[PDB]
C-alpha cells in the first residue's frame, strides 16, 4: 500500500509522448521512483501510464499542477489512488 499511495496515473498520452517527456514533466511534482508507460501483452507501448514519486506528498501536486496540461497539444489525464 506504501507505493500504491504515492502513484498517479496518467492518460490520453499523444502518440509522441515517451516516459523521458513524462519524468521530466513529472519530476517537478517531487523526486520520482520510476515511470511507466504500460505496455500491452504483445509489448507494444499504449497511451496511458504510472508514475510513482518517493513521497506521497507529491500525489495532490501533480493532479493539482499537472491535470488536463496539454502535451504535445492533448490534456492529459492525471489521477490518483482512489478505494471505497
Do not use: M, W
Not at 55 to 83: D, F, K, M, Q, T
Request: aromatic share 10%; with cysteine; proline share 6%.
Amino acid at each position: 500500500q506504501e507505493e500504491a499511495d504515492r502513484t498517479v496515473f496518467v492518460g490520453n498520452l499523444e502518440a509522441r509522448v515517451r516516459e523521458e517527456i513524462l519524468y521530466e514533466l513529472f519530476l517537478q511534482a517531487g523526486p520520482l521512483t520510476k515511470v511507466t508507460i504500460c505496455k500491452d501483452r504483445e509489448g507494444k507501448p499504449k497511451s496511458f501510464g504510472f508514475v510513482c514519486f518517493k513521497h506521497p506528498e507529491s500525489v495532490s501536486y501533480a493532479i493539482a499542477l499537472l491535470n488536463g496540461i496539454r502535451l504535445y497539444g492533448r490534456p492529459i489525464n492525471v489521477s490518483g489512488p482512489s478505494s471505497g
